[PDB]
Each structure stands twice: as structure tokens, then as C-alpha cells.
Amino acid sequence: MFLTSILLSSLYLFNRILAWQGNVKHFYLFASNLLLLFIVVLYINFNTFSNSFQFNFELFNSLNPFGLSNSDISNGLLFGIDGLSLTFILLTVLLIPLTLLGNWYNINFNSNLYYTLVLAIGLVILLNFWALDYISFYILFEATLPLLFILIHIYGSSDSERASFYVLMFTLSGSLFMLLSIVVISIVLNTTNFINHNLFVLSLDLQTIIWLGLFIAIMVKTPLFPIHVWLPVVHSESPLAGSMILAGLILKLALYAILRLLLPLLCEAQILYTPMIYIISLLTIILTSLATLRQIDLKVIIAYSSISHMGIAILGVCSNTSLGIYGSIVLGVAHGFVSPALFLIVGGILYDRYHIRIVNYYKGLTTYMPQLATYIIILSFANIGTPLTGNFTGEFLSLQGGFIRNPIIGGISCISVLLAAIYQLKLTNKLTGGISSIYMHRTNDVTIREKFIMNILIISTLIIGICPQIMYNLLYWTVNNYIYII
Template identity: 50%
Template structure:
């Protein structure tokens, strides 16, 4: 746990409260200060430092996710700019963001676990304070599911600690463990990862939590927290438990395939808009996992690209259904809306474009990610890989169903017509859509960044 983290958050909270007291309880000042500091928080990631015996540094792999996180923190703060009037909420989002940011930087397995767990605290408080109607259940789900599964992860970490007396990545990566020990530790680690990703039998927490949590929480959850599982797979499991991960690949491929098929089919019959987006992120994370375990550079790169793409597109979709539409109608039911094209044209355009991004249409980063992940997966296992490509079709079907339902048809006379997208919402949409389109059309930068990483990590 970083001392710097504690001091930064404490300073920001105290400073913002002090200023707001000085300006006669002007709440807007607190929001602005927290927004500015959430942007500034990306500055320390440029440096490398060590703190209480743990090194914090980045390489290309974590750079991608650090950039994503640093980008999403201010975005999620802006997303709740008008509808929540309490400084505690913004402090919680800010803290959650910092924790996630540093999670990708620490170079120690135990620290990784600590940040992984500690991010539950602000999330739990946020959901049970500002969540929707079913928030009690959602808060329990996120806490107990994740805590229980990651205790198995902690058990594996304890074995590292017991064997090597250290859990630093560099130190642990130098060791080769026996096959049976690796298998047991892989299973322990996999419990944590499978729940966080989430894989099919352990996924029931995700739709509830995503749909009930406030918008900023959903955005950070879908955008960053699900990627923690992919990151854990890459950092904690592939380098040290490499034999076991080869051994378990068929099993995980099967699970991923089940997840893709099952969640895509489940999505087809959901009525809650936020639940649909949540389910769709599940099937995309399963694609990521397949790419990560494909044992090829291409698959791993694709997996990371898809992580980044999904981290941009999924928050944008959440923003659309949970923010723009929800703020206006206070309703998340899909069948409530129709004919948005007639009176909210700008929103409809955004929705169409993001939907196409989400299904992985060409010229979006999602396409590149899915292409490489699937190519890696087919390389590893032609049968399962080619079956997994079905997921593109399935995701297209539910996404198109949703988009059609919302944008098509006539405006219902029972629904009030409201103003189209505001400047703030426009800004958010563009912020999230531009990078997706840009990297989709010109993925070379991304590829270069990732390729250098692979050299650092695996060819040294």
C-alpha cells in the first residue's frame, strides 16, 4: 500500500473541503478541485518510484492500461457532474481511480492483491450510498463474491511468500516451481481471475452490480476493474505459472467459449439497458482471456488492444444508457424507449457508432483487438477458436437489436420529448469515441507500444 496514495487523497480531500468552507460551502468548487486533481494524478505515473519497499514502475503493457485509467477517472467524474450533489461521492470516485491506477504500477504480487481488494472499499460504499433501487444486493454481491474468490488468490500468494520470502515480480519470475505446485497455485489464482473477468459460472454478480451502481462506478468497473483480471493473468500467472497455464489452457478456453455463447444468448432476452451492456462486456472479456492464453504475441497484443477498446466503448455505452437517457427519463427499460432518431438525432448517431464499435466493426479499435485475439486463439486451438468467432455474430445480433429498438420506430406519444445531448455529454462522447476510431484506423502506435513491451518482458 502506497504512502503516496494516502497522502495524495488526504491532501485533496482536505484541501477541497477547506476551500469549500472558505467559499461558504460552495459545492461546485469541490467538484472542480477533484476534477483537476484527477487529471493531475496521471503525472506521477511518468516517474518510477519505490515506496515502503515496493517498486512502482510501468512498462508498455501496463502503460496501455495506465493511460486508459488516467483517461477514465476525469471522464467518470464529469459523467456524474450534475446528478449527484455530495462531495463524498466525488472523493470516492477519485480514490477508486487512484487505487486502480497504482494497481497497474506496483511491481509486487502482494501489493497487487492489496490494491485489487482495496478498490472494493470505495466501490462498496459508493454502491450502497448512491446506487439504484436494488443497491443492497449489489453491494453485497461485489463485496462477498470478490472477497471470497480472491482469498484463494491470497492463498497462492502466501505460498509465494512462504517459498521465496518475497513476492516481487522480478524475483518470482526467476523461479521455476514444480508442476504440481504450479497447478495448485494456478487454480487458486484462477479463482480470483475467473470471478473478476467474469467467467460463466461465476458471473452472476456482474449484471447486478453494473446495473445498480451509480454511473461513475459502472464506468470504472466496466472500463478498468474487469481489465484487472486480464492484467493479473498476464503479470501474475503467465510468467511464473507458465507450465500450469499451458496445461490449463484447454479448460479455460472451454470456459471462455461457454461464457461467450451463454452471455451473448442471455443478453438477447434482457430488458434492462445497463444489464445488456454489462452482459456484452462479459463476452468481450472472454475474448480477451482467449487471446491472452493463446501463447502468441499476436493474441496477447490483441487481448490488450481489445481491453483498451472495450475500456473506451463500454463506459461510453454506459454513459449513454445510464447517464444521458437515465437522467432524462429515469428509466432503464429497453422497451420504454423508441424512435430516438426522430427527436434525439445526435444521440442516435453516437449510439449507432458506438454500437458498431462494440460489435467489432472494422475501423474501430475493437475490430483490431478482436481480430488479433481470435487469430491467436485459432492459432492455439483451431476448433475452439473458430467456434469462438461465432461470438462476433452473436454480439452483433443483440447489439443491433438494442440499437434498433432504441433508435428505430416512431416516437411514442406517451413519452415526453426532451432536449438532445448537452455540451457536457457531447464532450464525454467525443472523448471516448475519438481514441477508439483513431486507433482503429491507425493502430500502428498501439502496436509499437505493445511490441516493445513484449521484448522487455519475454525476450530479455
């Protein structure tokens, strides 16, 4: 009766702010900001001494469909956290007011639609990381895709039709095979669960051919080599919020799903088959970080940059070693900071000022925007993997973990520091230097909100870069929960 009364009051407050105020930009900010105050107090009461799942709730049980349940028979949808599951929630919740802010003075046409869609595809990726069944992980692994389709189609820049079709099609096409491999282990085990499946072994001939259905499902989501067709051409026509929340949140989900789904029940099917993961991760690092060099568009470069770092990260997960797991987690938490800041630089600030994203118009940004050329350089040099930034801690530990498992593939894959410097510094010194361009009237300096976003996304890299241990208190069980070296 009490928690019903809270909802009946809050929906009424929402109704009256809809009535008097026109936009709900302010109430969406207020709600998404209170999500921080909630999740940090959840972090305070988090017991770090237990591998255990602390905060558990079932929705949609038989005996109580609309709400919570305490029964001895459970067929609802489980939810909970530990450690691993919690670092990515904390990555999420301090980013969604920044994408909700990110289009503040921008939209001007059906703003109530847009901010509803952005907040909704942020809440769905909160509950992605809360989920505990294979189906409750999966029923929110594609509740994003409708709202992503409509957020790209309406509000996309130009040629947003094709990008919206790609973000439905490729993700769905790789996702149905994940559904196959979930169906097979839900008719063999009769349990969808993230708690018990350490206990259940499978035949190697069974475990072999259900690892395919999940691996070529995460090959699409973190785009590996026969995929990443779609990644740059969903970025290059996205709006501003749906590019930040794509590249900071949707990509790290399959980094989370290769940990949560694959590694602890596919334990014996991987050690036969990690040296296909090393093939695919290396020739995404070698190939996709080499096609960055020849790119006329400016958002497409930061798209392929996201591909190259996510290809470094999944040869730290698939190392079956102890440094690589933590290195890939700190990659996922630091790339999700440094990368949406770059999308604020490319289609955030510069497309708001000049509305065309070809590189060839853009030189001499220093003479009339000095305190943007600083954010060009320190944020680029944060993307390359200069130390003290939190990207290098992740790149270093993941290249080290991938050097344990197979040292020749690690020695070849170490060249990524060079290959990630080449295109990023080539872009940085084209934009930063030269005479201020002919085509370009002088527009405003970078404004107070587009500094307030940036300094948050820069301090949050620098704190991880000075101390990567500020989140070892969470992760030290999940460094061990995934090793099978007997």
C-alpha cells in the first residue's frame, strides 16, 4: 500500500509538471540524477567480502505477478548484483544525465519524444546489468533495439533510414543465434540462472556447439571481423545522445556478456577454441585500426577507434588469466568515459556549429577556439593510451594477459599502441594546426555545458589513470570467478 502510494504520488507530480511546464527535460534530469543518489547508497551497503549476490529480487512470479515475491517455487525473472555487475551500473548511471544533458539546447522539435527515448534506452541498459536469468538477460538485450531504431530514424542526421535499418538488422541477425544457444541450454538444464551454472557441466560435443551460438552473437555486438560493417554507419548518422549511449554502453554490454554468459559454463569449450578468438581479435586490431587512415568523415574515425579498443579488450577476457580480466574491465570503464567525450567533440560541438562532418573543411581550430583545441589534444592523447589516463592501464594489462596465453599473438598485438596513435594524432594535427580555414566563419567558444560534460569525462579517466585500484574492492572475486587453469 505504501509503495503503491509513492507511485500514485510520483505519476501525479509528473502529470502536473507536464501540465504547467512544457518540457520534461527538467524532470528527466531530476529522475536520472536521483538514480545516482540511489545507486551510490546501494554501493555503500555493498558487502565486498562476499562473492555472493547481495540485492536479489524476482519480478513476475506466479503467486504475485505485479511485484515482489517470497515463495519456495520461482519462475519469474531474477535480478541482482555483485562486483562485476556493479562497476558497469556505476559506469552507466553517471553517464545517462550527461547524454540527457548532451542535447539540451539542440532538439527544438518534439523534445518530449526524444528525451523519453534516451532515458528509456538508458534504463533498459541499467536493468541489463541487473538481470540474472538467460531470458531476463535476453529480454532486455533487445528491448533497446525498438527505441534505438526510432531514435536513429527520426532525429538522425541525413541518410538515417539506412543507419536505422542497420542498427535493427545486424544486431537482430546476430542476436537470434544467441536466442538459439539460450533455448538449447534451457531445454537441457531446465534452468535459466546465473547462480547455479557453475555446477552444471555439459558434454564437450554439446558444449562445443552452443559456444558458437553465443560467440557469433557477441561478434556482432562488439563488432569483430566479419561484422563491423554496421558500426561506423550507425555512428555516422546517429544523433548525439544515441551515439554516446551506443559507444559507451551498448558495446561494453557484450564485454559483460562474454564474462557472464560464456566463460563459466563454457569452460572446457573455450580452451580448445580460444585461438580462434585470438585470430579474430588480432585481425580486428590489425585491420580495422588500419582502415581508419583513409576516412573522409569525422565521426566514422571515432567509430573505428571504438572497434579497435573493444578488440583489445576481448583478448584480455579470453586469456584465462588473472590480469587480463581486470584489464578488460578497466578498458570497459575507461573507454566508456573517453569515447563519448570524443563524440561530444565530433558531432556534439562541431556539428552543432557547422552542420557538416567532412574532415576537409576543418583546420586551424586553434586561432579562434584555443580552449577547444586543448580538449582536442588531451582527449586524443587519452584515447591513444598515454599513461595516467586509465586507457593505458587497461591496454597494458590486456596486452599482458593476452601475452600469457599465447606470446606470439601478444607480440604481434602489441603494435596496437602504434596503430592507435597513427590515426588519432593524424586527426588531431589536422584539426588543431594550420591557418584558420576559408570555409569557416568564426563561431562561439565552447560553452559552459559543453565544458561541464567534458571535465567530468576527463577527471573520471584521470582518477582511474592515477589509481586503477579504486575499483579493486569490487572486482577481486570476479578476477578469480572465471579462471580454469586447474
